[PDB]
Nucleic acid binder design. Structure first.
Ligand SMILES: Nc1ncnc2c1ncn2[C@@H]1O[C@H](COP(=O)(O)OP(=O)(O)OP(=O)(O)O)[C@@H](O)[C@H]1O
Ligand SMILES: [K+]
Ligand SMILES: [Mg+2]
Ligand SMILES: [Mg+2]
Ligand SMILES: [Mg+2]
Ligand SMILES: [Mg+2]
Ligand SMILES: [Mg+2]
Ligand SMILES: [Mg+2]
Ligand SMILES: [Mg+2]
Ligand SMILES: [Mg+2]
Ligand SMILES: [Mg+2]
Ligand SMILES: [Mg+2]
Ligand SMILES: [Mg+2]
Ligand SMILES: [Mg+2]
Ligand SMILES: [Mg+2]
Ligand SMILES: [Mg+2]
Ligand SMILES: [Mg+2]
Ligand SMILES: [Mg+2]
Ligand SMILES: [Mg+2]
Lengths: 131, 47, 380, 50, 119, 157, 109, 113, 78
RNA sequence: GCCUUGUGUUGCUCAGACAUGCGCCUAAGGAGAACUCCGAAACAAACAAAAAGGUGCGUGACGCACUCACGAGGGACUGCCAGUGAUAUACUGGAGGAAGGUGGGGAUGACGUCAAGUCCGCAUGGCCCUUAUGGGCUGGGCCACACACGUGCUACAAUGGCAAUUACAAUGGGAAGCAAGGCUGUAAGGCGGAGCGAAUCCGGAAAGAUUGCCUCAGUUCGGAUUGUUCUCUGCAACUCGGGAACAUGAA
């Protein structure tokens, strides 16, 4: 059964090694993984394509699973926070694709409207009236 | 067509943004760099 | 070498009496002599079409296929099996040629299938039928020769590569049979032929373009390409261009070993003073003229697995997506007919033949023609 | 010639690579150039090889 | 034919015949023939245009008696500077760290120098 | 049964013929490489298989023509070497005949420099007609056996 | 499965998987011994080993499946020995020796 | 059912030199049980302190692993962790794997949609 | 860059700070490269037992110091 | 090596079914007669999902039938039949079975002999050295070379050498680490890092088969020796390291 409240659901993985002898530090301690479903974020298709390009192989298509793993920090909570910051940065950068889509669509539309004898006379008359 | 332009211009600018998000080191010209020898542990104490 | 004397003696004695020409369930083994290839019926499936060797060489002067020659040297008789797969292909191209007064026929057909199933023999029988219909048939029995052997020079205008020896052998094999029709036909473009580098003799000095006369025929063009080694490549390209504008007779282009044009060629180009780079088959001029199936003409391209071409894509470039056809292996009745044919041709002994014996050989060879042919003398 | 260091057998005996033997990159580049693909196509190929 | 400074046999194929030139081996022959645009042909079937192209293509590499003279001159300058390698070259000893206790017979000679007259 | 799986599936052979085929394949195999010699043996069988006949019965006849019945052995009595004759068993006859066939075929291969299938079929066909190098080897062995027939009763086996 | 003659090895045709005629002959021998050629549709998945090892494994599997289909052909298959698992495997290498049984060259004097 | 437990759970990986099944009483209660392949490491030493090259003795080191699955809901994970921190398994080292799910806050990124 | 070798040649530290005037003395550093600023000078190179006297010329530039001071005596058997 | 029984994730998931994700190649505009129509457009688009057809790579749900992994067991004992024999011990054949007579292989090594080997692994009785036979650094040597012997590697080729295509393993190793994809260099190399402390992630098995070249040559056999140009590890490759490129081509 899923968590409380509402929103997209994350999945965490974390390790604790219980070594004997009174020395506690083990290299497997500091690795944290987080998994998310891409389609639950509700991004647009172009935003999803930019996300996939920005991600590479951390995205698995059969499950729609985006998994981020952090080992670069010395403590488990630090790697967890790094994973969440990376997820927020990925969503923020992936959302930008709509503006580029709108800009190049308007560029194509305006290229189509420049080469038209019907529209150019009306545009020139309207800019001649106001000079 | 419009389809190839819309499918190709949305994936641009990712090269520096990915390095900024993930903290990677970017070397576009492939010179010899000390990053590969500073990314390894300090095995002095162990010894 | 008196081994074959007894077999030849008994074979010469066996033609004196016609009660031995019986096949599976006693049906007569061969076609009636009054039947030609254009009038083959459903009821002829499972029989053997007799030929003449000199007449077959006359109809196909470009060279007999390796499968046909291998079957002939071991059966000792110019005969071929009539199958359903050839009949349906013939009906396809007859429907394409002239519609009769739910099966949409296809203009461009690629023959893929299991190794040693008879694609070369089927394409050769189709070319024989079309030339009996008197069409304009361009037959390439060895597509490996177009990319292997000879000189290679870079074209200074297009960037592609010129192969003059193969460019003149294509024209020679075309006009060895298609001379009297090319005397009739006329060219539809009169632009000058731009000259190219010759086969080891370099660029012609003084002559840059050969002008086309007003009353020039396709025969005049091809004879110009044969006689001048500085013009063969451009004449081959031009000939490909006028093969699509002819309206008098139907035109068919049949290529064997069609898969060799989708891989590397023999030639290599130096791209660095300490390195070399291989050249794809698409970068040849004579391959580039003929490879694309994006047109309106009747093209057949039969792959070959005997040549070690390797793996290709399922969606090949510059061809329609539905152009690929499967050429199936032998079935039970085809194997029964070929086993009784080898019994008639005395490739096996009369005292060891049985239903179980030929079924065992067929099930081992999995319907492979060459493996069945090589296995059946060991039938005991 | 397993002792000839300029041949593929000799390079395999020495446990090294060169023009004669070549790494996995050479097979990948050659198979990309064979099937008419851009060199930036990710390996393995997203097609069906028949 | 007289290409470089050596005789190329007329009856042999060109790829194996061109290796007769000093300074041309198995791979430079392939590079030269690929530069000329020729796969392989007999050396007596060569046209004069291909002969002058072959001469100008072979002339792009150091080859022949000048290469022999260069190699001899630098072996001589090592002796004249008299480093360790020059001393080994003058004494006819192996100069690339190889053992001389048992197995230096290519630089030294046959075991016809025999016995050594005592145990 | 591992040798000649094709001729075992297309069955109808006895133990003696199976043994003959296995021996003819395996005697010249080096370094465990069976494919080339099995292809050579199959095509040598196929050369008269396309022209009627029973090629395996031809092989049985050819080997029977070169089986030797008596051989010699070197026995030391009081310091001098004698050459004692003895009787050859049924397996050793077969092995000696097939070894002589393959030896003569390979010497003919070196002498004429032609295809090995041609050499093997040439020697087997000539051995079918009671002549050849293998038959001369058999008669030479019988000559050495019949020259020293007085020195039997020196036999130890 | 009872069928018409299909035979698949790892989703490929067996003519493709075993291009040698002798491997196919060894694979079709158990069917030809119990006289059931042309009655079966066989799908197998093979792995490990080399080529003759894979052929032997598929042959033993076919023989055991035939016996499971109908147990009265056991007397047919046991004479050809298609139900005996071959126990011969690669013997280990012993220390002080070059191979399993080959020793180093001995020096006496 | 016998399908895989996917959700909020604990997984214990136990590594040992001996079989953990020898002393089964010290294992925690669990829903599922499975075993991994054993791993061996080979040592070959000379027997003599001097030249007896052909006489060797061969020792090995063998590693064994076992995998335990515990189903647990979200409220009792912090209750179970206190006891799981204090276990005593005989001749073993254990590995605590935690599978839990939280939710995503969308408010500071919803402006970019 | 027009450099053919990406790495500097090796010269020892007591040469790197004095250069030429540390070049008329006994040296023990056989592993130092002969620099083009070292020409026309006399050194005594240690060979394990003695100091071989060597005058640096044009022909020794680029080699090592120890290439010209031999360690093993050339032997003549009886 | 064969068969039961229990446990099934990082392993298996065959057939027969249910649902799904992602990427491609086409051509495709809303409303009242069986959503069709007769309604709107100027110009090609397929846009917030939905809307067609060929496809490629997968995943989940159900399972763990099957392979495999692990724990515990079974099974082979001359047990049964016939003969030879001295009714014993045995020997020779057969049946059944996965396996037949010690089923294959390993581990296991008696009393003592060689005054066998080790005081330079270690511990030790006796003698000996003590501004030295003790301790430190740099440099050299253990890599020398008229010769002799031992152990190995590569070959003298056609049952072969080379190029292109195409198949099939097991044991192991990985944090001072293994490093997918991609860029750069003819190449060894260089940049950068998807995953992994590892049934989870990480390294084209070769002989083999198909096609072609070579045609008995001191050779397209064989790669010693040598020159030039570089590269990796390291404070440092002269004596004295590994590797690459091109050339030289002994016996
Ligand atoms: N209709 C037929 N009549 C006689 N023989 C046939 C026929 N079909 C196939 N065969 C036999 O099959 C053998 C191989 O035929 P073919 O050379 O056409 O193979 P393929 O299908 O072209 O495949 P590939 O070109 O890859 O070998 C021939 O030797 C021939 O004996
Ligand atoms: K030395
Ligand atoms: Mg063909
Ligand atoms: Mg060689
Ligand atoms: Mg590259
Ligand atoms: Mg790579
Ligand atoms: Mg083992
Ligand atoms: Mg079970
Ligand atoms: Mg028994
Ligand atoms: Mg015991
Ligand atoms: Mg003593
Ligand atoms: Mg001592
Ligand atoms: Mg030894
Ligand atoms: Mg990483
Ligand atoms: Mg491990
Ligand atoms: Mg091979
Ligand atoms: Mg071959
Ligand atoms: Mg040579
Ligand atoms: Mg160096």
């Amino acid at each position: 059964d899923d968590p409380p409240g509402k929103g997209p659901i994350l999945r965490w993985q974390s390790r604790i090694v219980f070594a004997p002898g009174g020395d506690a530090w083990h290299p497997k301690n500091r690795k944290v993984k987080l998994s998310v479903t891409v389609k639950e974020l509700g991004l647009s298709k172009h935003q999803a394509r930019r996300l996939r390009e920005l991600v590479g192989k951390r995205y698995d298509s059969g499950k729609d699973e985006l998994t981020i793993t952090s080992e670069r920090f010395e403590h488990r909570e630090e790697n967890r926070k790094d994973c969440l910051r990376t997820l927020y940065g990925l969503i923020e950068e992936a959302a930008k694709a709509n503006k580029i889509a709108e800009d190049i669509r308007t560029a194509y539309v305006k290229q189509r409207l420049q080469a038209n004898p019907a529209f150019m006379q009306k545009l020139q008359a309207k800019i001649m009236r106001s000079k | 067509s419009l389809k190839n332009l819309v499918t190709s211009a949305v994936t641009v600018g990712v090269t520096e943004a990915r390095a900024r998000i993930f903290g990677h080191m970017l070397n576009p010209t492939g010179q010899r760099s000390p990053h590969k020898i500073l990314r390894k542990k300090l095995f002095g104490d162990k010894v | 070498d008196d081994l074959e004397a007894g077999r030849a003696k008994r074979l010469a004695d066996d033609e004196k009496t016609p009660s031995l020409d019986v096949g599976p369930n006693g049906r007569p083994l061969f076609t009636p002599r009054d039947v030609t290839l254009s009038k083959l019926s459903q009821k002829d499936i499972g029989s053997y079409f007799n030929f003449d060797e000199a007449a077959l060489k006359a109809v196909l002067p470009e060279g007999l296929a390796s499968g046909i020659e291998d079957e002939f040297k071991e059966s000792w008789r110019p005969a071929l099996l009539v199958r359903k797969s050839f009949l349906d292909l013939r009906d396809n191209f007859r429907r394409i040629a002239d519609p009769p007064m739910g099966v949409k026929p296809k203009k461009q057909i690629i023959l893929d299938g299991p190794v040693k199933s008879g694609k070369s023999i089927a394409l050769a029988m189709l070319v024989h039928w079309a030339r009996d219909e008197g069409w304009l048939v361009l037959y390439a029995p060895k597509g490996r020769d177009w990319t292997h052997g000879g000189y290679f020079y870079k074209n200074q205008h297009t960037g592609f590569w010129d192969t003059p020896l193969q460019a003149e052998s294509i024209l020679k094999d075309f006009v060895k049979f298609n001379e009297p029709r090319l005397r009739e036909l006329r060219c539809n473009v009169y632009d000058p032929i731009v000259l190219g580098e010759g086969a080891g003799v370099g660029y012609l000095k003084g002559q840059e373009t050969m002008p086309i006369p007003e009353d020039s025929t396709l025969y005049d063009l091809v004879q110009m390409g044969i006689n001048s080694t500085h013009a063969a490549v451009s004449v081959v390209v031009r000939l490909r261009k006028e093969l699509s504008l002819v309206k008098d007779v139907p035109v068919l282009i049949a290529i064997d070993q069609y898969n060799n044009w989708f891989t590397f060629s023999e030639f290599e180009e130096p791209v660095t003073p300490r390195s070399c780079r291989p050249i794809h088959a698409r970068e040849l001029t004579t391959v580039n003229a003929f490879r694309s199936m994006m047109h309106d003409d009747m093209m057949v391209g039969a792959f070959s697995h005997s040549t070690a071409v390797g793996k290709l894509r399922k969606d090949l470039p510059d061809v329609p997506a539905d152009a690929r056809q499967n050429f199936p292996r032998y079935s039970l009745d085809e194997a029964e007919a070929v086993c009784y044919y080898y019994l008639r041709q005395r490739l096996v002994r009369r005292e060891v033949f049985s239903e179980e014996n030929w079924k065992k050989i067929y099930y081992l060879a999995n319907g492979n023609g060459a493996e069945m042919r090589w296995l059946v003398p060991f039938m005991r | 010639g397993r002792g000839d260091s300029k041949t593929k057998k000799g390079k395999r005996f020495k446990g090294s690579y060169g023009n004669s033997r070549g790494k996995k990159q050479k097979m990948i580049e050659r198979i990309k150039d064979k099937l008419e693909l851009p060199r930036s196509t990710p390996w393995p190929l997203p097609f069906k090889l028949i | 034919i007289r290409v470089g400074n050596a005789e190329v046999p007329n009856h042999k194929p060109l790829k194996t015949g061109l290796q007769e030139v000093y300074g041309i081996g198995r791979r430079k022959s392939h590079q030269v023939l690929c530069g000329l645009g020729i796969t392989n042909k007999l050396a007596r079937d060569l046209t004069g245009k291909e002969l002058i192209d072959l001469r100008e293509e072979v002339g792009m590499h150091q080859h022949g008696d000048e290469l022999r003279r260069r190699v001899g001159s630098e072996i001589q300058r090592l002796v004249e500077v008299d480093c360790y390698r020059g001393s080994r070259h003058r004494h006819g000893m192996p100069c690339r760290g190889q053992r001389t206790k048992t197995n230096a017979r290519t630089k030294k000679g046959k075991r016809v120098a025999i016995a050594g007259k005592k145990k | 049964x591992x040798x000649x799986x094709x001729x075992x599936x297309x069955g109808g052979l006895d133990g003696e013929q199976k043994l003959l085929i296995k021996k003819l394949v395996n005697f010249r195999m080096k370094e465990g490489k069976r494919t080339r010699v099995r292809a050579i043996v199959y095509q040598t069988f196929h050369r008269p298989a396309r022209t009627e006949r029973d090629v395996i019965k031809l092989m049985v006849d050819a080997v029977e023509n070169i089986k030797p019945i008596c051989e010699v052995a070197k026995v030391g009595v009081a310091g001098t070497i004698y050459d004692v004759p003895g009787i050859v068993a049924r397996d050793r006859q077969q092995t000696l005949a097939i070894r002589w066939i393959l030896e003569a075929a390979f010497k003919r291969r070196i002498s004429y420099r032609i295809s090995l299938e041609k050499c093997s079929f040439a020697e087997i066909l000539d051995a079918y007609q009671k002549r050849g190098s293998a038959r001369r080897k058999r008669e030479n062995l019988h000559g050495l056996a019949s020259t020293n027939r007085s020195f039997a009763h020196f036999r130890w086996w | 499965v009872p069928g018409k003659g299909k035979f698949l090895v790892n989703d490929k045709e067996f003519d493709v998987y075993f291009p040698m005629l002798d491997h196919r002959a060894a694979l079709l021998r158990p069917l030809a011994e119990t006289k059931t050629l042309g009655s079966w549709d066989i799908n197998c998945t093979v792995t490990g080993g080399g080529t003759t090892g894979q052929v032997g494994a598929i042959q033993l599997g076919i023989s055991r499946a035939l016996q499971n289909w109908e147990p009265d052909m056991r007397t047919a298959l046991r004479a050809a020995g298609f139900l005996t698992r071959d126990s011969r495997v690669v013997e280990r290498k012993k220390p002080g020796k070059a191979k399993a049984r080959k020793s180093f060259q001995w020096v006496k004097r | 059912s016998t399908s895989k437990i996917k959700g909020t759970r604990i997984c214990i990986a136990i590594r040992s030199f001996d079989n953990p099944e020898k002393e089964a009483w010290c294992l925690p209660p669990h829903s599922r049980y499975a075993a991994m392949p054993d791993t061996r490491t080979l040592y070959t030493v000379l027997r003599s302190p001097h030249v007896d090259k052909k006489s060797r003795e061969q020792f090995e080191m063998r590693f064994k692993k076992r995998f335990l699955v515990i189903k647990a809901q979200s409220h009792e994970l912090s209750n179970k962790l206190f006891w799981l921190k204090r276990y005593r398994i005989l001749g073993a080292q254990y590995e605590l794997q935690f599978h839990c799910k939280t939710r995503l806050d969308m408010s500071p990124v919803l402006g970019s949609k | 860059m027009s450099r053919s070798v990406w790495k500097d040649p090796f010269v020892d530290a007591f040469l790197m700070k004095k250069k030429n005037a540390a070049l008329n003395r006994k040296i023990w550093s056989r592993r130092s490269t002969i620099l083009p600023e070292y020409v026309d000078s006399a050194v005594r190179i240690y060979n394990g037992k003695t100091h071989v006297r060597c005058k640096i010329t044009e022909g020794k530039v680029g080699h090592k110091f120890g290439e010209f001071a031999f360690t093993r005596k050339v032997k003549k058997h009886a």
